[PDB]
Amino acid sequence: AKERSKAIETAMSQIEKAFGKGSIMKLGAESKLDVQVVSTGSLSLDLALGVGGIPRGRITEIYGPESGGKTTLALAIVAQAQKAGGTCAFIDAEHALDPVYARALGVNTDELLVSQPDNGEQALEIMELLVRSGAIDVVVVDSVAALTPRAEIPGLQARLMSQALRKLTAILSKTGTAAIFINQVGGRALKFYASVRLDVRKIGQPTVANTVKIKTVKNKVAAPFKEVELALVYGKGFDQLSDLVGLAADMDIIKKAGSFYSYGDERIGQGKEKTIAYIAERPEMEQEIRDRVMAAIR
Amino acid sequence: AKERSKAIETAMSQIEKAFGKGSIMKLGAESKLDVQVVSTGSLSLDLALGVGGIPRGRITEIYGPESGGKTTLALAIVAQAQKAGGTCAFIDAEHALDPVYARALGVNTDELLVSQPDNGEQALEIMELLVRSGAIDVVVVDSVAALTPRAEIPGLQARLMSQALRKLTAILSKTGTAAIFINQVGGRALKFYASVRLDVRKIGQPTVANTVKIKTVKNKVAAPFKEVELALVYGKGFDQLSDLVGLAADMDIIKKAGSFYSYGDERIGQGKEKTIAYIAERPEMEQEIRDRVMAAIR
Amino acid sequence: AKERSKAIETAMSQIEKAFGKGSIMKLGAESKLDVQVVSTGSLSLDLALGVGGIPRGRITEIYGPESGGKTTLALAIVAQAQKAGGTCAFIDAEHALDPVYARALGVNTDELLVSQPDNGEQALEIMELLVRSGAIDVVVVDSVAALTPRAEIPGLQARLMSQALRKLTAILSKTGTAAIFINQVGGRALKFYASVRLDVRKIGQPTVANTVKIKTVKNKVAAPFKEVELALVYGKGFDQLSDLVGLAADMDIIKKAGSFYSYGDERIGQGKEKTIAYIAERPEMEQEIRDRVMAAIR
Amino acid sequence: AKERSKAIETAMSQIEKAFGKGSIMKLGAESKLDVQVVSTGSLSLDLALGVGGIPRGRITEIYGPESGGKTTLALAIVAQAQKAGGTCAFIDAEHALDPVYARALGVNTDELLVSQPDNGEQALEIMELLVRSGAIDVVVVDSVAALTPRAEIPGLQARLMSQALRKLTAILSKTGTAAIFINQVGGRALKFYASVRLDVRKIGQPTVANTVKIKTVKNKVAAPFKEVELALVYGKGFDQLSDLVGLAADMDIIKKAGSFYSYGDERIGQGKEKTIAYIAERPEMEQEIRDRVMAAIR
Amino acid sequence: AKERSKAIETAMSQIEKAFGKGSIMKLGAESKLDVQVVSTGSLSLDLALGVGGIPRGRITEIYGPESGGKTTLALAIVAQAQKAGGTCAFIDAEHALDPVYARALGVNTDELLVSQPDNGEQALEIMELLVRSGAIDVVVVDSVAALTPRAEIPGLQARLMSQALRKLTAILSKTGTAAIFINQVGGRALKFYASVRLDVRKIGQPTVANTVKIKTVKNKVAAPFKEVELALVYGKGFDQLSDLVGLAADMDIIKKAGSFYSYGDERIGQGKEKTIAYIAERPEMEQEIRDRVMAAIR
Amino acid sequence: AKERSKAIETAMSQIEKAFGKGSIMKLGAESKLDVQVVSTGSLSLDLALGVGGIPRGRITEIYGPESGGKTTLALAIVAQAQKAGGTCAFIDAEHALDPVYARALGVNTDELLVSQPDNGEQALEIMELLVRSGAIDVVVVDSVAALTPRAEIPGLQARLMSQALRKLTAILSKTGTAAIFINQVGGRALKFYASVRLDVRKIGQPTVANTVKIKTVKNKVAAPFKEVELALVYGKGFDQLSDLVGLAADMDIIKKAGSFYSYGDERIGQGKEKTIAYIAERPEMEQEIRDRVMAAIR
Ligand SMILES: Nc1ncnc2c1ncn2[C@@H]1O[C@H](COP(=O)(O)OP(=O)(O)OP(O)(O)=S)[C@@H](O)[C@H]1O
Ligand SMILES: Nc1ncnc2c1ncn2[C@@H]1O[C@H](COP(=O)(O)OP(=O)(O)OP(O)(O)=S)[C@@H](O)[C@H]1O
Ligand SMILES: Nc1ncnc2c1ncn2[C@@H]1O[C@H](COP(=O)(O)OP(=O)(O)OP(O)(O)=S)[C@@H](O)[C@H]1O
Ligand SMILES: Nc1ncnc2c1ncn2[C@@H]1O[C@H](COP(=O)(O)OP(=O)(O)OP(O)(O)=S)[C@@H](O)[C@H]1O
Ligand SMILES: Nc1ncnc2c1ncn2[C@@H]1O[C@H](COP(=O)(O)OP(=O)(O)OP(O)(O)=S)[C@@H](O)[C@H]1O
Ligand SMILES: Nc1ncnc2c1ncn2[C@@H]1O[C@H](COP(=O)(O)OP(=O)(O)OP(O)(O)=S)[C@@H](O)[C@H]1O
Structure with missing residues (x-):
């Protein structure tokens, strides 16, 4: 009833041994x-x-x-x-x-x-x-x-x-x-x-x-x-920014509170339009949020 | 005229002996x-x-x-x-x-x-x-x-x-x-x-x-x-339920009387729509009728 | 000129002796x-x-x-x-x-x-x-x-x-x-x-x-x-009946006179459609005509 | 220069003596x-x-x-x-x-x-x-x-x-x-x-x-x-007749003159189609021309 | 250094004495x-x-x-x-x-x-x-x-x-x-x-x-x-003629001068096609060139 | 421990005396x-x-x-x-x-x-x-x-x-x-x-x-x-030359220095292809290198 959960990860390993990581x-x-x-x-x-x-x-x-x-x-x-x-x-x-x-x-x-x-x-x-x-x-x-x-x-x-x-x-x-x-x-x-x-x-x-x-x-x-x-x-x-502002908000990389977005304990616009527009003016910022999100996924 | 019916089940057996159950x-x-x-x-x-x-x-x-x-x-x-x-x-x-x-x-x-x-x-x-x-x-x-x-x-x-x-x-x-x-x-x-x-x-x-x-x-x-x-x-x-209500009714697992369906000496809806809808609200019930039907077939 | 017809059935016999009935x-x-x-x-x-x-x-x-x-x-x-x-x-x-x-x-x-x-x-x-x-x-x-x-x-x-x-x-x-x-x-x-x-x-x-x-x-x-x-x-x-009505008529088992079919000194329909339809209503009759035709061929 | 033509038919004979007629x-x-x-x-x-x-x-x-x-x-x-x-x-x-x-x-x-x-x-x-x-x-x-x-x-x-x-x-x-x-x-x-x-x-x-x-x-x-x-x-x-009319005409068994065919000093049609069609109506005639042609070849 | 060339034709002879002409x-x-x-x-x-x-x-x-x-x-x-x-x-x-x-x-x-x-x-x-x-x-x-x-x-x-x-x-x-x-x-x-x-x-x-x-x-x-x-x-x-015109030309039996072929101090066509075609019309000529070429080889 | 090495060449000799040079x-x-x-x-x-x-x-x-x-x-x-x-x-x-x-x-x-x-x-x-x-x-x-x-x-x-x-x-x-x-x-x-x-x-x-x-x-x-x-x-x-250029180079008969080949204090090509091609143009040279190599082996 438990040694079962074992046989499972054992076959996974065997399979990965024989065909490599990601095989199953x-x-x-x-x-x-x-x-x-x-x-x-x-x-x-x-x-x-x-x-x-x-x-x-x-x-x-x-x-x-x-x-x-x-x-x-x-x-x-x-x-x-x-x-x-x-x-x-x-x-x-x-x-x-x-x-x-x-x-x-x-x-x-x-x-x-x-x-x-x-x-x-x-x-x-x-x-x-x-x-x-x-x-x-x-x-x-x-x-x-x-x-x-x-x-x-x-x-x-x-x-x-x-x-x-x-x-x-x-x-x-x-x-x-x-x-x-x-x-x-x-x-x-x-x-x-x-x-x-x-x-x-x-x-x-x-x-x-x-x-x-x-x-x-x-x-x-x-x-x-x-x-x-x-x-x-x-x-x-x-639209990469729309995607970026959305995903970073969800990961708390950029804080959202209702229609209020902020980054670095600093308000950056109300609503997605204003906020994606705020990042659009700061390549430095876009890049940093980008690496923060990348780093997180990874 | 009768020892015939015998030779038949005898060959069936031989066939099943040689090739297993279900061979004929x-x-x-x-x-x-x-x-x-x-x-x-x-x-x-x-x-x-x-x-x-x-x-x-x-x-x-x-x-x-x-x-x-x-x-x-x-x-x-x-x-x-x-x-x-x-x-x-x-x-x-x-x-x-x-x-x-x-x-x-x-x-x-x-x-x-x-x-x-x-x-x-x-x-x-x-x-x-x-x-x-x-x-x-x-x-x-x-x-x-x-x-x-x-x-x-x-x-x-x-x-x-x-x-x-x-x-x-x-x-x-x-x-x-x-x-x-x-x-x-x-x-x-x-x-x-x-x-x-x-x-x-x-x-x-x-x-x-x-x-x-x-x-x-x-x-x-x-x-x-x-x-x-x-x-x-x-x-x-x-549509599993439609199938379920239909087959369970036919097996008397759920009693049907004209357009009236009941289960456990208790009315559960008039017409298939109302009845399949009654079961749809009770997982407990769906499961139990499901095992009752399974058990019966078996 | 005649002892020829003899040699023929003699070889047929020999052939059937050697290889069985139906060999030629x-x-x-x-x-x-x-x-x-x-x-x-x-x-x-x-x-x-x-x-x-x-x-x-x-x-x-x-x-x-x-x-x-x-x-x-x-x-x-x-x-x-x-x-x-x-x-x-x-x-x-x-x-x-x-x-x-x-x-x-x-x-x-x-x-x-x-x-x-x-x-x-x-x-x-x-x-x-x-x-x-x-x-x-x-x-x-x-x-x-x-x-x-x-x-x-x-x-x-x-x-x-x-x-x-x-x-x-x-x-x-x-x-x-x-x-x-x-x-x-x-x-x-x-x-x-x-x-x-x-x-x-x-x-x-x-x-x-x-x-x-x-x-x-x-x-x-x-x-x-x-x-x-x-x-x-x-x-x-x-279509077995169509086949049956046709072959039985030809063997005089069922009498046909133009478009008139009869069986047992009794009219059973005019035209094949009506007649095959008459037999289709009487299994007793279909079977009996069927055995009569079988018996005849045999 | 001539006793040569002799040695030839002599060997043919010897060959036919040893292996039968048709051997060469x-x-x-x-x-x-x-x-x-x-x-x-x-x-x-x-x-x-x-x-x-x-x-x-x-x-x-x-x-x-x-x-x-x-x-x-x-x-x-x-x-x-x-x-x-x-x-x-x-x-x-x-x-x-x-x-x-x-x-x-x-x-x-x-x-x-x-x-x-x-x-x-x-x-x-x-x-x-x-x-x-x-x-x-x-x-x-x-x-x-x-x-x-x-x-x-x-x-x-x-x-x-x-x-x-x-x-x-x-x-x-x-x-x-x-x-x-x-x-x-x-x-x-x-x-x-x-x-x-x-x-x-x-x-x-x-x-x-x-x-x-x-x-x-x-x-x-x-x-x-x-x-x-x-x-x-x-x-x-x-098409045996076409073959027959053609070969019999060539052997003068049936006289042809341009497109005119005749047999027995009697016209039997103009053109092959009409003539093969004339014979096709008379088995007596087909057979007789057939034996005449057979007899001739032989 | 020379009596060598002698021993060679001597063995050839011996070999031909023992096994016949063409043995070597x-x-x-x-x-x-x-x-x-x-x-x-x-x-x-x-x-x-x-x-x-x-x-x-x-x-x-x-x-x-x-x-x-x-x-x-x-x-x-x-x-x-x-x-x-x-x-x-x-x-x-x-x-x-x-x-x-x-x-x-x-x-x-x-x-x-x-x-x-x-x-x-x-x-x-x-x-x-x-x-x-x-x-x-x-x-x-x-x-x-x-x-x-x-x-x-x-x-x-x-x-x-x-x-x-x-x-x-x-x-x-x-x-x-x-x-x-x-x-x-x-x-x-x-x-x-x-x-x-x-x-x-x-x-x-x-x-x-x-x-x-x-x-x-x-x-x-x-x-x-x-x-x-x-x-x-x-x-x-x-294609015997093509072969013939070609070989006879090479043996000077038929004179060729560029694309000009002649035989018997008489022009017989320009190009192989015309010339092989000229011979093709004269059996007398084909035969005579044929014997001339045969005779020459021999 | 040494008179052993003697018995060996003595048997070799005896063997060669009895069966000739090359017997062992x-x-x-x-x-x-x-x-x-x-x-x-x-x-x-x-x-x-x-x-x-x-x-x-x-x-x-x-x-x-x-x-x-x-x-x-x-x-x-x-x-x-x-x-x-x-x-x-x-x-x-x-x-x-x-x-x-x-x-x-x-x-x-x-x-x-x-x-x-x-x-x-x-x-x-x-x-x-x-x-x-x-x-x-x-x-x-x-x-x-x-x-x-x-x-x-x-x-x-x-x-x-x-x-x-x-x-x-x-x-x-x-x-x-x-x-x-x-x-x-x-x-x-x-x-x-x-x-x-x-x-x-x-x-x-x-x-x-x-x-x-x-x-x-x-x-x-x-x-x-x-x-x-x-x-x-x-x-x-x-390919005799390829063989020749290779073996003569190894015997120093033709000097090779990296990809540079020379013969008679005179450059004859860079690379085997160019060099075998240089000899291919001079029969005099091919022959002389050939005898030099022959003579050396011998
Ligand atoms: N050269 C362009 N200029 C402006 N917009 C473009 C251009 N190419 C593509 N687009 C936009 O991008 C959309 C998709 O085009 P692409 O990605 O090339 O399509 P695709 O999937 O590559 O299909 P194909 O077969 O390569 S055209 C187009 O419908 C436009 O909205
Ligand atoms: N991804 C899906 N989303 C919604 N409905 C689906 C989906 N896949 C299948 N269906 C429904 O189920 C039906 C049959 O699809 P499937 O069972 O995949 O067919 P199939 O027999 O597996 O054939 P293939 O070759 O695998 S697509 C579809 O026509 C839809 O009615
Ligand atoms: N299951 C069926 N239901 C209704 N009609 C059928 C069915 N099977 C066959 N038929 C009818 O009978 C015809 C011949 O089918 P069959 O006798 O199976 O053919 P067959 O000669 O057995 O060829 P196969 O390779 O076995 S399909 C079909 O074209 C239909 O007219
Ligand atoms: N049963 C038939 N009914 C009508 N025409 C036929 C039939 N059999 C043969 N033919 C005709 O005669 C032609 C030759 O058929 P056959 O002489 O059987 O051929 P074959 O040389 O015997 O070859 P196989 O391998 O025996 S079919 C066919 O292409 C048709 O033109
Ligand atoms: N009966 C023929 N009618 C027309 N052309 C032919 C005929 N026979 C041979 N040829 C031609 O001559 C070529 C060689 O055929 P043959 O000399 O019979 O071959 P072969 O070397 O004798 O081989 P086999 O095994 O005897 S067929 C054919 O490919 C045709 O170009
Ligand atoms: N007549 C030829 N013309 C061109 N190349 C040839 C010829 N004969 C042989 N070769 C080449 O030399 C190779 C070996 O052939 P040979 O030395 O005759 O073989 P072998 O060892 O003598 O075998 P057999 O049984 O005598 S053919 C062939 O595969 C070709 O590459």
């Missing part, structure tokens, strides 16, 4: 897996992701319908990796990157490495060369579908992926490089090699601004199946 | 096979299943079209196994589990063990480790198709299944673990190793609520080929 | 082989079969495309064997038996013995145990293809069949058990061991009701190569 | 070997066969692809043997004989002897018993492939054939029985024992009607390697 | 062995063969894959032997000879002697009787593999060949008969008894026309190991 | 046996062979799988014997010699003596006549297996070999003729009569070019069991 876990368990992260920019999503952002040295797949927020999300991450002093690369087979918007998302466009390959083989190879340099923080692949095989310009891409993803995965596990694959819905190789899989899609009616639900359909670094609903406004992206 | 039986025979069960939540189905729920220590396959009710059914069972104080595990290769809905089905999400393997081998292996712990009541595999072989990322999965199912079956026979395999329609190994096979598919036009027929196409624990038609309403699942 | 025969010859039969329910087919139904103590193969009528035919036969007071068994490796329909075909579902084996060996073995009891009238095997070998869960089933069919054939020859094997198109062992082989397939366009041609491609009990075209209506099966 | 011959030589024949129904083929039809007391192999015309040809021959007052037998291991079609080919179905053996040994044995009766004109074996050995239900059939064909050949040489073996492409024993080997296969595109080339790849009774192209129309068979 | 020779030596020949039709091959065609009184083996050109080559030779007024024979155990094609190769079909034996013994015996007549120029055996032993209808054919080839070789050495054995790849007896062995196989991609390389892997009448690449066009055979 | 030796001993050699073309192999090439007046067996390099090696040797002004002979019972390739290996095809015997006796006899002339430098026998006995066209070849090898060995010991026997794996007579036995077989995966290991499994002229791994490229043979 209770959905309500506290993650705590030791991995380096790259924040998405929206702390709630970082919180839902359990470990605080997308895991370095691992593959992350972001999929869903077109206009859903995949590219926005992806860019938000490089913007974050660059602000931390990192170097990112964009492997483009789509030809749709808007730099103006990418800058509106905080991406340093001029320092962004871009490659537009002739074929899927080449793309994966260019991806490998970079990650093998150990000096790249984030590599975004856009997109999985566009990655057509060389000879095709009988199901060789399903194998191209499997073949290269296998090779890429081994080397990547030890580089601190977060590899992001965008998928508009070979994905079967990705489905199993990815450590994280984000389902991104718009919900409801627009307003200029739309709401997009993001679900962690797969997470081998923390409990999966947690979701978040963010606000994606045209030309601006996901 | 008259379709109208009273089951009565001594096996532990895990209720599906819908008593009619428990009744159709002959032995009161899906059999522990055995494999159960639930198949049919997508959106048919397979996952709902499966979750209903773990919800039931947990409410009885058990521990369940979900082996996911599909990446579609909605916890909110799983909770709406009565599943304790936080205590639910989840695994999202890299390949079919790994999945079956993780399944084995758990069942071998003897502390797991229900393991759900979702799904059979997604269980792609390792090397494939020439028909190795048909053998992977046969190979592991063989091994799993032996050990499982003595663990009190009910293993559920969901199948969207290697299944040939399952077809023969499964002790129970449920055909689940929607029938007719929706209403928010749809009707799904469930047939016991295979039953090695009780007479096969019995079917049931349940109501599956969006976000709620199968 | 003129296609237009009157069967008359002394064997017990189990009516198919459609008298024309019983007539085409020469000896009045499928032969007891022998193997009968029913093959053709799926949805062709094989299972319907098979069930019709057990329905017939049961109505004569017999006991039948169904060896199922397909898992598709619809009891509701089986009852709509006249099968006593509750008294029907059912077995759902783990492998082809087991199935054939269960078949043997039953037939060896000498108390089983009809055993249906569904189906030949599904009968996969044990070790397979290099062409062992072609030998499994040959091996068991050989053994089964010897014992069966003396049991009064009619063994039916359904085949969706090891069949090479069956092809040669079967005494009767029915080709069943739908012809033309449906109407709810479809027409199915049934040919006696093999008959070692009566002249082979006779065919019949029956009406198979959804949920009902083959 | 010039491809353009006039057959004239004294043997009884059974017409194929198509006079051109009878003409190509050199001796007027397939040779009695000898073996004839008819091979080629399925749907090529082998069975049609074979049936045409029995139809011919029966019309001459003979008795034929069909040894079937294929189970595909369509009597309706066989009648459409002129075969008297009711007087046709049929045997459907349990094994290749039995078939050959039944073949022997019949031919040994000396009262059988044509025996058709369908087919060589289906003739599987008894014990097989290590290359025993290649020997079964060799063994029985050897025995059959000796006795057959003196019975006036024409033995036909159909072969879908043990055949190595046949290849050498057959006195005639017909290659039958469809050529070109259909029209209901298809063209089939028939080549005498082996002929030990007349010059080999002559071929014919016949018209095989569905349900009807090879 | 320098690969670049001028053949010049006095033997009668039968041209292959392609002068290059006649030239490669050293002595101008296949040697009479000797055995020649032609082997290689099916569809390689063996039969074409063989027929080309009889066509040549007949045009010189000779008589040829074809010993067929394959049953594939197409006379139409044989005529398209220049073979006089009607005067071609054909034999289709019952067994390998018989074939070799028929071969002997003919060659012993001293009136046969070419005997083709098709093929070595098909030549199955009598008793086989333990390695008796390897001995059958050795036994008969030994006997055949002695008598043949003095008959002017060229014996050709076709071999699809007992051949070990042939390998050593053959005086010439031609390796015939297609090379590269087709065009209707294919290229076939022919190598003299064995030549006891002239230097071995010379090869030729001919053009084999469907229904036509090896 | 330390595996690390310096060969130095006075024998004339014929270089293989690959200096490493000449070095591994201890005495600089295959020994004249002795027998050398080259064996291994087909396509291993045996024939290539053998031809390389005659190419070498001819370049030194010698005369070689090829005794062929295989019929596979490609002169084009033989020329690509440096063999003067026109001056190469070729014999294609009727039987093993004849081959060995022809071998004897030549070697007895004392004017032949290299005789290659291809191959041992093909050398079938005369009467065989009970183990007479095992004796044929023993019989002739015995005779051949005595005379050969004094002729300066190097006899090479190729063996595809009577070989037992060879095994013991051979003074050298080379094991030749490909190792690993191809590249056009394959690697072949050659081991001196038997050496009665120098320490046995030394091996070499050469590069055999299609149509070219063993």
